[PDB]
């Protein structure tokens, strides 16, 4: 059985814990708040008293801690020979992220990031179409990710860094990069009070224009809304020489209440976390490489920091290949 050290005991860790176990892994949980004790008992997992103890005998570490702590936790696991899956964004700076990528490559350990969007059906199918040549040469894409934030942002993040919009932009930036390739130019306008700490329901809108090495262009809109009406909406429309494909998460899928307003028919498809951890587990057990690699984790961090800088300085940011 694959052995996974899960660091953190918050909401993401709890979702990852359940998915690892559902994939067949054995897990040990460590968080610096002590809450890893009762978290592991709730799910039947192991509790470790330290990161070193959690890493001792581990095949992989799953870092589900605040972003600023990703850099040293990842570097510790890599030096110990433990492969890494890290929650997004990979690190708190593009420079920290590159350092993790280089260390993992020289130590020859696997390095993945949990870019969840890639593991849900509309986005995986979009990449499949584009990569198989079905759309021809990509030319133009619009992506929007919009949600009500139901918890407060308790960490400290400046407006210059993009604050809350950086969180929402990582989905769209990663999707555009996945679909159209390397981004060579970034422009963004950020609207709203975006620094954290910030409350549930804080409102902000960020509009980004990404130019890709191929010449394709992506418009990525990232939004936090005041109310869960709806809780989440994603939409996209992608055009190439071979045609166009579109998506709206509001469209009805397998289960649709047509009238009367019943609320007991919730269905959201397969959990992205089940799909994610299963694919990662398979990779760590010698299987094929997952749909996201170290260089993707690094690309996303670079894009969101260039967009934050563009919004702050009013300049477009060039990222030559």
């Amino acid at each position: 059985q694959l052995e996974v050290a899960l660091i953190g005991a918050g909401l993401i860790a709890r979702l990852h814990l359940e998915a690892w176990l559902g994939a067949g892994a054995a897990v040990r949980v460590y968080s610096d708040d002590g809450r890893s004790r009762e978290l592991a008992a709730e799910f039947g997992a192991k509790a470790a008293g330290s990161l070193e103890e959690a890493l001792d005998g581990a095949d992989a570490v799953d870092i589900c801690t605040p972003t600023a702590s990703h850099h040293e936790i990842a570097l510790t696991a890599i030096a110990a020979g433990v492969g890494v899956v890290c929650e997004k964004p990979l690190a708190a700076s593009a420079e920290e992220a590159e350092e993790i990528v280089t260390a993992a490559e020289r130590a020859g350990v696997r390095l993945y990031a949990a870019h969840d969007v890639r593991f849900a059906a509309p986005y995986a199918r979009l990449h499949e179409l584009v990569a198989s040549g079905r759309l021809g040469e990509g030319a133009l894409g619009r992506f929007s990710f919009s949600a009500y934030h139901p918890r407060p942002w308790t960490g400290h993040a400046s407006a210059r860094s993009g604050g809350i919009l950086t969180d929402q932009l990582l989905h769209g930036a990663d999707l555009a990069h996945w679909v159209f390739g390397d981004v060579v130019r970034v422009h963004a306008c950020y609207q709203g009070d975006i620094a954290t700490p910030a409350p549930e329901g804080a409102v902000a809108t960020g509009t980004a224009v990404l130019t890709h090495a191929s010449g394709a262009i992506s418009q990525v809109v990232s939004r936090w809304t005041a109310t869960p009406r709806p809780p989440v909406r994603v939409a996209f429309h992608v055009s190439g020489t071979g045609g166009s494909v579109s998506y709206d998460s509001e469209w009805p899928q397998e289960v649709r209440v047509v009238d009367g307003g019943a609320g007991n028919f919730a269905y959201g498809g397969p959990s992205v976390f089940d799909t994610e951890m299963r694919e990662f587990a398979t990779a760590f057990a010698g299987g094929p490489e997952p749909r996201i690699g170290a260089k993707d984790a690094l690309a996303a961090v670079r894009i969101i920091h260039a967009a934050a800088e563009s919004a702050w300085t009013g300049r477009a940011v060039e990222l030559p290949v």
Binding site: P122, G243, E254, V258, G260, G261
Partner: protein
């Protein structure tokens, strides 16, 4: 485990079954020439079968006699996690008292009433609690292109409870056979669509669950598809529907 297949597309299911380990496909055939599968059933094989044609009830009974509970009827959409959600929501009163089932399916197979309507009736039977039918009315035509048999059909079922089902079937060369069913109660309605649109565009992309994988899982391991009695109820519906399409009047059962 030894396995046999009865379907219009036997090479389809035989390929997926061989692709899994510890399983061996000893026979695969169409209901036109079912005997190699019947002898495999007598010899102990698990048999996954599509609904037989309305004309071959004695072949159906020969398969029941040969396999007993080793015979499993293929009804992919019954195995959706989405369908479990719908059944539970309705049983919990999410739409009030259930009165009416509607739905539509398109298939590439000729004779769409016998070929596609069982897939909708299977979903109806599950949610209706296996209620028996009191009358069946149907009409068919051959306007749309096909080889043999009707290329469009509508049937309405009146159940002894007073509940009503009514389904429309049509042939099309690029159809999937994936049904969409709508359950109407006196406080609302909910739709289960086994083949929703995932992506729009000039060539829309079909969403949905991996119903093939789920159905084969159950068959290699009593699940939510029709058991034998449910299949016989639906097959009797089908026979009555063909009779009604000819007489122009409902058939009493």
């Amino acid at each position: 485990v030894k396995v046999a297949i009865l379907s219009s597309t036997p090479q389809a299911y035989a390929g997926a079954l061989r692709g899994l380990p510890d399983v061996e496909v000893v026979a695969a055939a169409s209901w036109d020439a079912f005997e190699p599968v019947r002898q495999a059933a007598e010899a102990g094989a698990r048999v996954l079968c599509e609904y037989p044609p309305a004309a071959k009830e004695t072949d159906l009974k020969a398969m029941i006699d040969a396999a007993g509970d080793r015979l499993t009827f293929a009804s992919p959409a019954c195995h959706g996690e989405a369908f479990a959600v719908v059944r539970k929501g309705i049983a919990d009163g999410g739409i009030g008292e259930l009165t009416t089932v509607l739905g539509s399916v398109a298939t590439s197979v000729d004779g769409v009433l016998g070929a596609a309507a069982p897939y909708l009736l299977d979903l109806a039977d599950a949610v209706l609690g296996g209620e028996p039918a009191q009358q069946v009315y149907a009409q068919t035509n051959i306007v749309l292109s096909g080889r043999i048999g009707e290329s469009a059909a509508v049937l309405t079922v009146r159940y002894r409870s007073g509940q009503v089902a009514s389904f429309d079937c049509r042939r099309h060369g690029s159809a999937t056979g994936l049904p969409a069913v709508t359950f109407i109660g006196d406080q609302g309605s909910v739709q289960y669509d086994a083949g929703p649109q995932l992506l729009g565009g000039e060539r829309p992309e079909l969403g949905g669950e991996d119903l093939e994988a789920l159905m084969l899982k159950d068959f290699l391991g009593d699940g939510p598809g029709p058991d034998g009695q449910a299949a016989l109820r639906t097959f009797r519906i089908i026979q009555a529907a063909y009779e009604s399409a000819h007489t122009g009047q409902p058939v009493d059962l």
